[PDB]
Amino acid sequence: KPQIITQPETTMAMVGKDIRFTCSAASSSSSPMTFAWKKDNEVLTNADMENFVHVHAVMEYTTILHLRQVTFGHEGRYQCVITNHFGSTYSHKARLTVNVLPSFTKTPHDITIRTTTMARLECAATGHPNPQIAWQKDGGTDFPAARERRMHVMPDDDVFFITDVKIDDAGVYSCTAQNSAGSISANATLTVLETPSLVVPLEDRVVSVGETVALQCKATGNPPPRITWFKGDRPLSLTERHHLTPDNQLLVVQNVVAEDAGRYTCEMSNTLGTERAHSQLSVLLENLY
């Protein structure tokens, strides 16, 4: 009749680390006690046990089963058995399961993509139990591809993709793999560009000598396109009568003159390419001299 005080509790351990089970008992008598541990109903001979004694004023003896450098083979159901000259006491059964920290097999890398195309992000990890993959943009969740349900994943090939890439999709994306052991994460910067284009069409104009004409070239694209104006096929020579906004988008010519007639070309460029828009300016002449 050795009466158990502390019973071994079910626990989890990471592979490679040490773990321990403890049960402690105290006999009604002073007859010596013997501790045993039986895994899956088969004892460990050559087992690593360590024994302690407590002096409560009762002599409580504690036994510790050391499991050094745990592997998957250590996985099982453990129990402590205490024997004296009276009888044997049996403890609760404690389960031991094992962890393996997640390790990346595929990480996303920095890419530069155009608008309206499809961006692909690879990300996979091993580990026990199998890790779940989570995503972040700039450290959060309020990002357009998620909010607009445009981000998806291939079913069995571990590939994430975004359809119809917006400008606001650009930023740092963080891939995070997590299980019951821990978390790891990898960054990838998505950079989104757009070829230059015209917002509103550039229309032909017809004005009379002395009137004022205005040509607007509202250009989009990323990076913001540099705008250059041309008359004929030479760069536009500016006068006191010519006006430009700093962005060069609005071109105004006051007091139009016969020499002003001709084709005005709007040239929009960035690192992706160049687009052009044309406007024919016709002038209604009353008298040349």
Ligand X SMILES: *[C@@H]1O[C@H](CO)[C@@H](O)[C@H](O)[C@H]1NC(C)=O
Shortest separation between residue 109's beta carbon and ligand X, angstroms? 12
- Decide: residue 25, CB within 10 A, 0-12 exposed, 13-18 middle, 19+ buried: buried
> From the CB of residue 45, how many other CB atoms can be counted at a distance below 10 Å?
5
Shortest separation between residue 139's beta carbon and ligand X, angstroms? 5
Measured in whole angstroms, the distance separating CA 195 from the mean position of its chain's CA atoms is 27
Compare residues 64 and 188 and give the one whose CB is closer to ligand X: 188
Shortest separation between residue 146's beta carbon and ligand X, angstroms? 17
Return the residue of 91, 174, 270, 279 that touches ligand X, per CB under 6 A. 174
Shortest separation between residue 124's beta carbon and ligand X, angstroms? 18
Cα distance between residue 288 and residue 209, in whole Å: 10
Return the residue of 53, 58, 118, 172 that touches ligand X, per CB under 6 A. 172
**Per-residue contact flags (x/-) with ligand X for residues 43 to 82, judged by CB under 6 A:** ----------------------------------------
Compare residues 69 and 187 and give the one whose CB is closer to ligand X: 187
Q: Do 31 and 117 contact (CB within 8 A), yes or no?
A: no
Compare residues 3 and 189 and give the one whose CB is closer to ligand X: 189
- Name beta bridge partners: 122: 159
Compare residues 178 and 195 and give the one whose CB is closer to ligand X: 178
Shortest separation between residue 57's beta carbon and ligand X, angstroms? 56
Cα distance between residue 134 and residue 127, in whole Å: 15
> What distances in angstroms separate CA 54 from CA 72, 87, 112, 238, one per listed residue?
34, 22, 67, 99
Given the structure tokens 């058995």, which residue do they identify?
A: 81
Shortest separation between residue 172's beta carbon and ligand X, angstroms? 4
Give Cβ neighbours of residue 238 (< 8 Å, ≥ 6 apart). 244
Give Cβ neighbours of residue 64 (< 8 Å, ≥ 6 apart). 20, 21, 22, 49, 50, 51, 52
Return the residue of 87, 139, 155, 246 that touches ligand X, per CB under 6 A. 139
Return the residue of 69, 103, 141, 187 that touches ligand X, per CB under 6 A. 187
Say how many residues touch ligand X, by CB under 6 A.
4
Compare residues 118 and 172 and give the one whose CB is closer to ligand X: 172
Query: In the complex, which residues of this chain contact ligand X (CB under 6 A)?
Result: 139, 172, 174, 187
